[PDB]
Amino acid sequence: PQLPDFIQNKIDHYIENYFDINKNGKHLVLGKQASPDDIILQSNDYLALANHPLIKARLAKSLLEEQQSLFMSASFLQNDYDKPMIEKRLAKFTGFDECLLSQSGWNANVGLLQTICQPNTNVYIDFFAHMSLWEGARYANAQAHPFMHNNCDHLRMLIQRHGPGIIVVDSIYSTLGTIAPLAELVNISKEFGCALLVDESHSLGTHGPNGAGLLAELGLTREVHFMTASLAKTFAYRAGAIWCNNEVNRCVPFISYPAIFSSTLLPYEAAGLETTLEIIESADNRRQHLDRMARKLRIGLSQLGLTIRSESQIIGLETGDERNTEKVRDYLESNGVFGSVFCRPATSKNKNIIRLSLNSDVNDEQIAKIIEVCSDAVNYGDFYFR
Amino acid sequence: PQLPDFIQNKIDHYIENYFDINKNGKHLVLGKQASPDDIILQSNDYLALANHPLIKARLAKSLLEMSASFLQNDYDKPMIEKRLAKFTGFDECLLSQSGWNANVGLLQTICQPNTNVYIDFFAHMSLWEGARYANAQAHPFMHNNCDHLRMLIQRHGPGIIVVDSIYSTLGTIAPLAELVNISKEFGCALLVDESHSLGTHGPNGAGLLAELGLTREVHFMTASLAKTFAYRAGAIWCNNEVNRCVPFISYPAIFSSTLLPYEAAGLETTLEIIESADNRRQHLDRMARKLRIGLSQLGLTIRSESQIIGLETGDERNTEKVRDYLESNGVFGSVFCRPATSKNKNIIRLSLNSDVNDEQIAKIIEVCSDAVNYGDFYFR
Ligand SMILES: CCCCCCCCCC(=O)C/N=C/c1c(COP(=O)(O)O)cnc(C)c1O
Ligand SMILES: CCCCCCCCCC(=O)C/N=C/c1c(COP(=O)(O)O)cnc(C)c1O
Ligand SMILES: [Cl-]
Numbered sequence: 001p002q003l004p005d006f007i008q009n010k011i012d013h014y015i016e017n018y019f020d021i022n023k024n025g026k027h028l029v030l031g032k033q034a035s036p037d038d039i040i041l042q043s044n045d046y047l048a049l050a051n052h053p054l055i056k057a058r059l060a061k062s063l064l065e066e067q068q069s070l071f072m073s074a075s076f077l078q079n080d081y082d083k084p085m086i087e088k089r090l091a092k093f094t095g096f097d098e099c100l101l102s103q104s105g106w107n108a109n110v111g112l113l114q115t116i117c118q119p120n121t122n123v124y125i126d127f128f129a130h131m132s133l134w135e136g137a138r139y140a141n142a143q144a145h146p147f148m149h150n151n152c153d154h155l156r157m158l159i160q161r162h163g164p165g166i167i168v169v170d171s172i173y174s175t176l177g178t179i180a181p182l183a184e185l186v187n188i189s190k191e192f193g194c195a196l197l198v199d200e201s202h203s204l205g206t207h208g209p210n211g212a213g214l215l216a217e218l219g220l221t222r223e224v225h226f227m228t229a230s231l232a233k234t235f236a237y238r239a240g241a242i243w244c245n246n247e248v249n250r251c252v253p254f255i256s257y258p259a260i261f262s263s264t265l266l267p268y269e270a271a272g273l274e275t276t277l278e279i280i281e282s283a284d285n286r287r288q289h290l291d292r293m294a295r296k297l298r299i300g301l302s303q304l305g306l307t308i309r310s311e312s313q314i315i316g317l318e319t320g321d322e323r324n325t326e327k328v329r330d331y332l333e334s335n336g337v338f339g340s341v342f343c344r345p346a347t348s349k350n351k352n353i354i355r356l357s358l359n360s361d362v363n364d365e366q367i368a369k370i371i372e373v374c375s376d377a378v379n380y381g382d383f384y385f386r
Numbered sequence: 387p388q389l390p391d392f393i394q395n396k397i398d399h400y401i402e403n404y405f406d407i408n409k410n411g412k413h414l415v416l417g418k419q420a421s422p423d424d425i426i427l428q429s430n431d432y433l434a435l436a437n438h439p440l441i442k443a444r445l446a447k448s449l450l451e452m453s454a455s456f457l458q459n460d461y462d463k464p465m466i467e468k469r470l471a472k473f474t475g476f477d478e479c480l481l482s483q484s485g486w487n488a489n490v491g492l493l494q495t496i497c498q499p500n501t502n503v504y505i506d507f508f509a510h511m512s513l514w515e516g517a518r519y520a521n522a523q524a525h526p527f528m529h530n531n532c533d534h535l536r537m538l539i540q541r542h543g544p545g546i547i548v549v550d551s552i553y554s555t556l557g558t559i560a561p562l563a564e565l566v567n568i569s570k571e572f573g574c575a576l577l578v579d580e581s582h583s584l585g586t587h588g589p590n591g592a593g594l595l596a597e598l599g600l601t602r603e604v605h606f607m608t609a610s611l612a613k614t615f616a617y618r619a620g621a622i623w624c625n626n627e628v629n630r631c632v633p634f635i636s637y638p639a640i641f642s643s644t645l646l647p648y649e650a651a652g653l654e655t656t657l658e659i660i661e662s663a664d665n666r667r668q669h670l671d672r673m674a675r676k677l678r679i680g681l682s683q684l685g686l687t688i689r690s691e692s693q694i695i696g697l698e699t700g701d702e703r704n705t706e707k708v709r710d711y712l713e714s715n716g717v718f719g720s721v722f723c724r725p726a727t728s729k730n731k732n733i734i735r736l737s738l739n740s741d742v743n744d745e746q747i748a749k750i751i752e753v754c755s756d757a758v759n760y761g762d763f764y765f766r
Contacts, residue, residue: 001603003605004544004575006545007628010498011628011630014635015630026459027455027634030459042456056449056450056451057450059449060445060446060450063446063449064446066437066442067431067436069437070436071430071612075413075415076415076416076428078412078413078415079416081419103618104483106642131641135519138519139515164390189387195390222387225387232643238644238646246389246397247401250405251397251401254404255725260726261486261726262484262485262512264618266618340456345637346640346641
């Protein structure tokens with residue numbers, strides 16, 4: 001069947017503009033194939049749990065136990081006896097009143113926002129908040145008011161102008177790894193009668209007592225209305241969750257379109273999460289090691305004169321435009337360093353990033369090596385850094 | 387902290403209007419807990435594969451022992467995709483995290499801000515929302531009504547025609563052959579969501595398009611793999627190069643984590659079982675026809691031509707009464723209400739699967755017969 005010219009031309013153009021323009025003819029995010037000894041810094045499995053034998057054993061076990069044939073909407077599974085223990089456990093874990101399982105962090109954000117927003121609703125969103133939060137607001141037809149990254153002064157001015165709303169931030173930001181000024185955001189929330197929504201995808205498991213997160217680390221838990229997280233990072237699982245210090249999670253399952261109209265996690269998936277939680281709660285050792293290696297990389301790269309905004313295990317090399325980004329990517333890759341290209345639609349076209357994500361398995365030698373490769377890239381590379 | 391009024395007010399009213407008015411103070415979809423004796427007709431696992439010993443073994447085995455945008459190199463793309471393309475007769479297949487994401491991502495990839503999307507009034511919500519997120523121009527056409535569609539396309543110009551092969555709430559079948567003609571005639575692209583026909587229909591379960599010999603004139607086919615394939619994923623099929631681009635354009639494809647590599651191996655075994663389940667397809671088809679005839683003759687509107695049977699129960703108060711009657715008598719369907727239906731056209735859906743018995747079919751007809759005679763409520 002021949003595509004109509006209205007679609008054919010769009011694909012033809014995309015291919016020319018997004019694939020062809022690159023030396024290797026692939027999309028920018030696709031470099032060379034890595035090798036065993038290369039240093040890979042791409043996975044969000046921060047505490048290196050993907051292959052944990054206890055997690056695998058518990059998943060396989062409950063999977064082998066059989067089937068409830070629960071291939072249907074989670075809307076139908078909201079009777080207390082159908083709700084998975086993992087929700088009660090995750091709630092207790094973070095200190096929030098209630099938790100609701102979602103199919104992904106994306107759906108948790110889109111779902112929560114749909115539930116708490118009306119079309120008139122003011123949404124004060126950090127310019128660098130995750131796309132799912134921007135999109136969640138847009139799907140709900142809310143009135144979004146972006147504030148400059150981590151800028152509480154700018155935020156106050158916005159709220160003073162537009163009224164009570166929902167303040168939306170990442171606790172730790174996904175591209176550049178900065179940390180939100182959470183204590184002050186809470187004070188602003190309280191001052192102006194707003195609700196706070198904190199996405200802890202990148203701090204949950206890695207931060208706080210027993211890995212309960214940044215809000216728990218800072219003692220803010222009881223002062224925040226909402227928290228969300230992808231469970232695809234530290235929890236190493238394809239799912240998400242919404243936590244509420246109120247009754248909102250009673251309503252989300254029947255209001256959120258992704259919650260209603262897309263199939264539920266199967267019971268055996270929830271059970272595997274229970275073991276993951278247990279391992280995370282006990283992983284003080286890995287948390288400490290990760291923190292230290294991350295501080296080492298930050299400091300080391302900073303002394304190079306590189307712009308390093310990060311205060312976390314996420315480190316963003318700012319490589320400007322797509323041409324310059326290809327060059328840096330190639331140089332990094334040729335030498336044994338494999339980060340992730342972040343580019344448009346995630347960034348603006350002239351502010352691409354090569355993201356280095358650290359995990360608790362990275363060691364002191366690999367760190368030193370990464371500093372060295374970047375040192376050379378600076379000194380000698382035929383390209384620039386922002 | 388207490389919610390600000392602008393949230394608290396909304397939640398308060400919602401709970402009053404959606405939970406409080408029902409006899410059990412819960413949302414309308416929540417009824418009684420079933421007993422092992424009861425007939426359960428809620429799962430979309432049509433060929434009853436959720437607990438198949440071989441599927442569970444393949445997954446356990448494979449498991450024992452980031453964004454998919456980054457995984458689009460030849461060597462990173464899973465073999466299940468090539469097997470699914472072959473199974474279906476379409477040129478290429480791309481895995482997605484859900485049928486919802488499949489539809490949303492495809493539409494985001496092929497739509498522009500004013501693209502005409504000619505969508506069946508009853509097409510899945512994911513297709514409606516996918517068009518909406520893309521800021522496409524939606525032109526709903528009355529259910530299965532090709533006259534209305536011809537008028538809309540004549541009026542608004544070429545665009546994308548979007549239907550379910552089998553419709554999720556009432557089990558009707560799209561007039562696919564005629565829809566193909568229309569798209570050819572009007573220079574449109576056709577998108578068919580086969581979530582409810584894939585695995586249950588066609589040669590080896592290849593689906594409705596394959597059954598009808600239409601594969602080669604449809605541009606796109608999508609499906610939730612959470613129905614017959616009994617897995618939390620979806621897939622986009624293309625008779626063209628579109629899947630080359632989806633992975634870098636669709637927001638769900640870019641910004642939400644990928645299926646893990648062991649999940650694809652489970653799909654491979656599932657596909658093999660489905661290809662060979664002629665027995666179960668046959669039995670299911672027989673039971674579904676038996677049910678439609680039995681119910682129709684009671685005077686209920688039964689629009690279904692498939693394994694999905696929709697009891698039309700009108701407004702919410704009536705629907706609650708019907709639900710409670712059914713459940714009290716050992717028949718458990720799924721309530722479909724608003725935002726899925728209009729508030730006055732609720733449905734109690736019966737999803738048949740290949741494990742369902744002759745004796746069970748008779749019992750459902752019997753319960754519905756008595757319900758029709760009871761006097762406490764109506765059916766449309
Ligand atoms: C507040 C509850 C309102 C009534 C209950 C509605 C239940 C809706 C459940 C679904 O819509 C499941 N849909 C699956 C699906 C999908 C998405 O598949 P997945 O995202 O579940 O894989 C796509 N296309 C079609 C035709 C589909 O049927
Ligand atoms: C055409 C390539 C564009 C550049 C590459 C973009 C890669 C983006 C990958 C992500 O955004 C993963 N995001 C996860 C995430 C999510 C969504 O969670 P999940 O749906 O993956 O469970 C929510 N919140 C935060 C802060 C998150 O970081
Ligand atoms: Cl990623």
